[PDB]
Amino acid sequence: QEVEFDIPPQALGSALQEFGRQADIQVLYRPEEVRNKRSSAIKGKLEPNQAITELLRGTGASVDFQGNAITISVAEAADSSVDLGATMITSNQLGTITEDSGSYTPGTIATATRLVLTPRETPQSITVVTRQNMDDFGLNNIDDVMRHTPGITVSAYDTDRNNYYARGFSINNFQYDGIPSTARNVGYSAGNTLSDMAIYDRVEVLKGATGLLTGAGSLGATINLIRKKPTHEFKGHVELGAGSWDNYRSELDVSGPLTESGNVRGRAVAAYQDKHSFMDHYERKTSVYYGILEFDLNPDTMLTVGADYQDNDPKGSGWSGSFPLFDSQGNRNDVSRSFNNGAKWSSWEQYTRTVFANLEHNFANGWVGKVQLDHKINGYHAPLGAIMGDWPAPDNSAKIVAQKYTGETKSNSLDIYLTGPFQFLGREHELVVGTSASFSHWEGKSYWNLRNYDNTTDDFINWDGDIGKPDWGTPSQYIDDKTRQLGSYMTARFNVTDDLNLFLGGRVVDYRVTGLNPTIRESGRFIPYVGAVYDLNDTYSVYASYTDIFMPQDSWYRDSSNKLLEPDEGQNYEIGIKGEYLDGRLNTSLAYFEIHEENRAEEDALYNSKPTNPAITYAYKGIKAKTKGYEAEISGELAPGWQVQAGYTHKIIRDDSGKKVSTWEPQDQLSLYTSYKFKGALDKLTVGGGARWQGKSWQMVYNNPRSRWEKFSQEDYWLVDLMARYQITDKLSASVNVNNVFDKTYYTNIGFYTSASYGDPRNLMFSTRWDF
Numbered sequence: 001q002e003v004e005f006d007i008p009p010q011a012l013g014s015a016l017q018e019f020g021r022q023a024d025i026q027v028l029y030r031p032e033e034v035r036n037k038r039s040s041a042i043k044g045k046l047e048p049n050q051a052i053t054e055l056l057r058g059t060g061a062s063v064d065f066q067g068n069a070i071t072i073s074v075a076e077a078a079d080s081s082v083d084l085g086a087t088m089i090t091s092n093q094l095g096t097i098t099e100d101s102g103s104y105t106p107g108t109i110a111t112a113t114r115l116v117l118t119p120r121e122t123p124q125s126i127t128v129v130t131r132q133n134m135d136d137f138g139l140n141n142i143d144d145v146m147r148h149t150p151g152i153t154v155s156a157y158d159t160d161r162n163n164y165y166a167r168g169f170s171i172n173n174f175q176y177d178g179i180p181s182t183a184r185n186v187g188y189s190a191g192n193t194l195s196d197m198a199i200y201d202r203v204e205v206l207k208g209a210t211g212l213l214t215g216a217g218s219l220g221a222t223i224n225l226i227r228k229k230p231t232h233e234f235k236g237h238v239e240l241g242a243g244s245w246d247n248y249r250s251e252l253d254v255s256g257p258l259t260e261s262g263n264v265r266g267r268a269v270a271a272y273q274d275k276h277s278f279m280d281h282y283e284r285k286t287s288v289y290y291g292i293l294e295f296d297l298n299p300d301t302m303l304t305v306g307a308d309y310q311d312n313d314p315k316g317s318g319w320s321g322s323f324p325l326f327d328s329q330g331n332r333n334d335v336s337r338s339f340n341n342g343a344k345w346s347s348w349e350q351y352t353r354t355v356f357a358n359l360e361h362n363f364a365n366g367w368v369g370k371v372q373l374d375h376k377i378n379g380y381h382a383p384l385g386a387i388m389g390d391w392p393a394p395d396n397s398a399k400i401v402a403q404k405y406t407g408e409t410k411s412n413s414l415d416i417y418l419t420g421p422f423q424f425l426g427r428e429h430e431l432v433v434g435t436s437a438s439f440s441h442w443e444g445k446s447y448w449n450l451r452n453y454d455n456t457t458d459d460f461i462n463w464d465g466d467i468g469k470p471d472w473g474t475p476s477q478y479i480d481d482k483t484r485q486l487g488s489y490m491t492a493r494f495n496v497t498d499d500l501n502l503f504l505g506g507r508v509v510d511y512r513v514t515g516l517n518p519t520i521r522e523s524g525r526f527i528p529y530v531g532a533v534y535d536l537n538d539t540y541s542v543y544a545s546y547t548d549i550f551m552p553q554d555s556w557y558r559d560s561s562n563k564l565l566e567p568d569e570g571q572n573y574e575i576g577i578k579g580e581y582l583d584g585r586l587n588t589s590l591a592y593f594e595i596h597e598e599n600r601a602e603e604d605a606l607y608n609s610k611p612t613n614p615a616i617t618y619a620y621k622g623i624k625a626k627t628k629g630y631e632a633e634i635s636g637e638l639a640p641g642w643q644v645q646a647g648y649t650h651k652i653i654r655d656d657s658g659k660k661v662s663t664w665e666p667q668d669q670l671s672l673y674t675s676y677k678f679k680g681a682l683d684k685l686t687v688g689g690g691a692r693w694q695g696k697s698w699q700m701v702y703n704n705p706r707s708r709w710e711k712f713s714q715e716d717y718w719l720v721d722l723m724a725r726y727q728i729t730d731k732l733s734a735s736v737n738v739n740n741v742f743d744k745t746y747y748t749n750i751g752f753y754t755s756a757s758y759g760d761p762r763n764l765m766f767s768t769r770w771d772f
């Protein structure tokens with residue numbers, strides 16, 4: 001709607017970048033097309049579509065309107081067949097904004113290489129949950145979003161930490177606006193499983209091996225969370241929502257110019273949720289605040305400062321799973337879904353805050369430069385207490401384990417990178433060159449030396465949490481770990497023919513972990529990136545890529561010889577076809593992929609049976625493992641009011657024993673979410689539904705009292721979601737989400753330290769949203 005403009009005549013490139021910014025729109029244009037042209041002048045309050053054609057007057061260019069993006073083209077009377085994936089310079093370095101897109105398919109993405117590219121242009125598997133997907137299905141945190149992310153599996157560690165798999169691996173890579181955090185372990189990583197969606201536009205998941213931009217990390221995927229940004233027109237909303245088990249949420253979101261001109265601009269959000277739970281004596285309050293100002297130092301240099309804050313504060317936390325699998329004498333426990341072995345006072349509170357600043361500058365080259373500075377904090381306060389062990393006993397008694405960890409991790413990050421186009425053999429290519437540095441320092445207290453506590457409870461079947469709290473005594477331990485990561489990376493994207501694009505890149509990495517453990521050092525490790533995309537028609541392209549990642553091992557993973565295991569490493573091999581329909585409004589992909597892992601830490605049973613090096617007491621073994629699997633997906637418009645996201649993934653991961661692994665992650669899964677917007681008499685109603693199926697999953701767990709291994713299975717099952725919205729008024733709407741319609745009872749954890757967790761029963765959520 002009607003924006004305030006001011007673009008004086010200049011290089012058409014500069015104008016287009018200046019426009020994207022002022023319009024809150026992404027502008028894509030091909031450098032060689034706009035290079036010897038200038039904009040015509042525009043001034044005043046205008047509608048962006050009128051505005052742009054006025055800007056383009058005299059230039060001979062056409063506009064393609066596409067949601068939150070415009071692409072500019074310069075048609076010739078010539079043309080010999082088209083360059084569908086021609087080098088395109090872009091006005092927003094993170095991609096197209098999904099807020100208000102009306103869509104479940106992303107626009108353009110930078111998660112792969114730092115280069116702004118469409119899913120069809122990216123030679124990796126990239127899934128995105130958009131802002132509208134999030135709104136329609138009430139996905140209010142990262143757990144909700146992973147549960148709705150095709151190809152991800154969410155399993156429980158305990159009431160306050162989940163695990164995300166892809167392709168056989170636990171995901172342990174998180175970025176925010178494309179900047180990796182340190183996630184070496186749960187010390188560094190407080191709150192990562194729990195971020196509220198209130199401050200984010202979309203989460204984008206890059207599946208495979210993602211070393212190129214993550215640096216040191218896990219195989220499986222990177223999760224990239226893009227923050228909400230300020231806008232040039234005023235707007236916002238308030239939201240109220242009320243759900244099953246005394247689940248209350250509120251949320252405020254405000255955005256706009258802060259000066260009469262528009263040269264300073266801000267966005268603020270605050271969200272608060274207080275919920276109980278189907279689980280007995282578990283409650284959890286969450287708080288979030290967020291604020292960001294953008295300042296135009298001048299028409300091609302912008303400074304951003306912002307901060308965010310999230311507190312997650314539960315009662316009734318468990319340490320591991322909701323209940324023990326086996327009783328004192330070895331029989332499987334049968335307990336209600338409400339069972340919670342957490343104590344009343346038990347809490348794993350987790351907090352996160354960031355202070356951050358950017359500087360982004362446009363060189364009249366058409367090259368853009370960007371510096372990103374971060375102060376991150378990840379803190380935890382964890383007085384835990386939870387029935388654990390083979391219980392109850394015959395007289396219905398049980399025993400509690402209690403320990404207390406507190407601590408904070410402080411992180412500092414510098415990320416700097418240049419990106420731009422270049423001519424080579426008569427054609428346009430582009431390149432990114434960046435360097436990065438992060439130092440993060442985990443400091444902590446632990447307590448396990450309980451003074452004079454009676455950790456037995458008189459009654460299991462009716463356990464309440466109603467147990468005393470111990471005297472924690474003095475600290476048992478002080479933690480002091482320091483990680484330093486340093487990167488340099490470079491990727492070229494060569495437009496080789498009119499249907500072939502070749503990716504040649506790499507990261508060199510220096511990684512040092514310091515402190516109470518023997519220093520862990522990796523110098524000059526190379527991480528290769530090779531990719532290709534071949535256009536087939538107006539619609540389909542094939543792609544192949546070879547990609548890599550590593551993580552230096554945790555310091556307790558030493559071998560026979562008391563020598564740290566080589567880094568845990570893998571390569572992703574992928575070949576696929578990707579389809580594009582309705583000018584980018586609908587995307588399909590079908591991929592085959594193979595992960596080759598090497599140096600996967602494993603127990604070393606033959607040494608462990610009777611150790612023989614005085615140096616080590618419990619060695620590990622570095623083995624190879626494989627993932628073989630295929631994946632298909634669709635997202636976007638199936639017909640005018642009709643949006644979907646859906647996926648199908650098949651996997652089996654084996655290790656050098658030949659035995660299946662990550663067998664809790666099902667071998668097959670499907671997701672399908674959809675909504676429909678009626679027209680005519682009922683254009684104000686949006687109706688929606690969803691299904692997630694997964695096939696058999698299992699775990700070998702050891703039944704101590706009987707001295708035998710057992711197989712625990714989860715037979716395949718469906719979960720059904722439904723959804724409706726009614727826009728009663730221009731400014732006000734109502735919603736209902738029913739989740740797990742058929743109240744399926746199933747498991748989200750079997751065998752995590754010999755325990756189990758249930759999935760959510762059927763739950764409802766009612767919301768109003770009010771847009772100013």
Ligand SMILES: CCCCCCCCOCCOCCOCCOCCOCCO
Nearest residue numbers: 254255256266267268291292293305306307
């Ligand atoms: C070193 C700490 C850094 C702190 C950075 C946080 C910045 C906090 O900014 C919050 C303000 O956001 C602005 C909200 O935008 C609302 C604008 O509407 C203004 C009123 O409009 C009147 C006429 O249109």
Ligand SMILES: CCCCCCCCOCCOCCOCCOCCOCCO
Nearest residue numbers: 733734735736738743762763764766767768
């Ligand atoms: C174990 C739970 C079993 C419950 C199953 C329920 C399935 C049926 O749900 C139907 C819900 O219909 C209720 C309609 O109520 C209207 C809500 O509209 C929101 C009002 O907005 C407030 C206006 O300011």
